[PDB]
Every structure is written in structure tokens, then in C-alpha cells.
């Protein structure tokens, strides 16, 4: 369709308004500290960001 209905549905909020910054997942997102990453992708990259285990 034309521009009048292709993206006319609002997504200014809600779960569909957020995707993982790595894999664009819409499930298991972590928005704490603006992480915006998939939970699995967080566990994958947590060494790379620097979240490490002490306990």
C-alpha cells in the first residue's frame, strides 16, 4: 500500500516499539541503564561490555 497505511499504525510505545540493539528481538529485552539488548545477547556480550561475576 501507499504511505497512508503502510506504517500508519502507531508504535510510539509498547513492546513492539522496542527491539534488541543486537538481534532486534522483541522478547527478553533489558532496558536498564539503556541496555536495549536481548537477554541472550546480553549473556553473550556481558564480558565485552564488562559486567562480570563476583558472586
Amino acid at each position: 500500500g501507499h504511505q497512508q497505511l503502510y506504517w500508519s499504525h502507531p508504535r510510539k510505545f509498547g513492546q513492539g516499539s522496542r527491539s534488541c540493539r543486537v538481534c532486534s528481538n522483541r522478547h527478553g529485552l533489558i532496558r536498564k541503564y539503556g541496555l536495549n539488548m536481548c537477554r541472550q545477547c546480553f549473556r553473550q556480550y556481558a564480558k565485552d561490555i564488562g559486567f562480570i561475576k563476583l558472586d
Binding site: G34, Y45, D48, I49, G50
Partner: protein
């Protein structure tokens, strides 16, 4: 102030940039002996150091490819122009870099070499480079459809506690 995000958010963004740059360099510099990336940051500018064995190969003809990647990283994260430099540095004892050795084994497997002799050669080179011990695991559709797993390990290798972090590289 208001324009700048909090220290918490800023450090999170720093870690995110580190992760994204490492992933991008891994996915692009895979064949050129990529080992790792180190970034040195200042308020004036930042310095990116890409640890790689084949510095002569990761660089294009008269530095064309390093210029390409510099422009890529300049545009992608939106730094000011000339606020980032990319240096290519040869690693010391590339036999000790599990990243580079894993990439070499992946190349030898994709080339068509037998997994057994390739793994033996990789392990032999690693121990000839000099280390307390090494361990390689191959899992996949070896022989038939049914999955099997091989572990080829020699020397010393711990598994538990703090010291495994800074004593064994994991790739």
C-alpha cells in the same frame, strides 16, 4: 550536565561500543588473522588499536582498507571527523592467541583438511609456541548425521576459581 548522560549510562555505552566494534571487526577481519581490539579514548580524540597477525593483509594497498574501515567507523557511530585513528599492530606469539588459532583452525577445516590432523597440527603448534597446556573441542556432524564430540587436550589446564580468568584464553 543535562546534555551528557549519567556516568552509569556513559559506561554502559562504552561497553556497548566495545562489544559492537569487536563483533564488527571479527565478522570482517576473520580471514586476516584478527586477534582482538583495544581502544584508547581521550576527550580530544580516540585511538583504536586492532591486534592482528596479518597487519600487511588487513591493510589494503597503500592503506586502502584501513582507510575504508576508518571511514566506516567514522560514519557509523558519528564521531567528529578526525577524532578517531585506527592502528594495526602485530600480536606477539600468535600461537598463544586462542582467537587467532581458532580462526586458523576454522580456515583449515573450511579448506577441506581432515579435522584430526588439522587439530593435531594446531595443538602441536600451540605447544611449540610454549604454554602450560591447551584444549580444543570439535562438535558437529562428524562422520554421519548423528552428532559426536572430540576433545583434544594436553598440558596443564585448570577449570575452577579466579585464576582461570587471566591464565586461559577462551574462544
Amino acid at each position: 550536565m543535562a546534555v551528557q548522560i549519567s556516568k552509569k549510562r556513559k559506561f554502559v555505552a562504552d561497553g556497548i561500543f566495545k562489544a559492537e566494534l569487536n563483533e564488527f571487526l571479527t565478522r570482517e577481519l576473520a580471514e586476516d588473522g584478527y586477534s582482538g581490539v583495544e581502544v584508547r579514548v581521550t576527550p580530544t580524540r580516540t585511538e583504536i588499536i586492532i591486534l592482528a597477525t596479518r597487519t600487511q593483509n588487513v591493510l589494503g594497498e597503500k592503506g586502502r582498507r584501513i582507510r575504508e574501515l576508518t571511514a566506516v567507523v567514522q560514519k557509523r557511530f558519528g564521531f567528529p571527523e578526525g577524532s578517531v585513528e585506527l592502528y594495526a599492530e602485530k600480536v606477539a606469539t600468535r600461537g598463544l592467541c586462542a582467537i587467532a588459532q581458532a580462526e586458523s583452525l576454522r580456515y583449515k577445516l573450511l579448506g577441506g583438511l581432515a579435522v584430526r590432523r588439522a587439530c593435531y597440527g594446531v595443538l602441536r603448534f600451540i605447544m611449540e609456541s610454549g604454554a602450560k597446556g591447551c584444549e580444543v573441542v570439535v562438535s558437529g556432524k562428524l562422520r554421519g548425521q548423528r552428532a559426536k564430540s572430540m576433545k583434544f587436550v594436553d598440558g596443564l589446564m585448570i577449570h575452577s576459581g579466579d585464576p582461570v580468568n587471566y591464565y586461559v584464553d577462551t574462544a
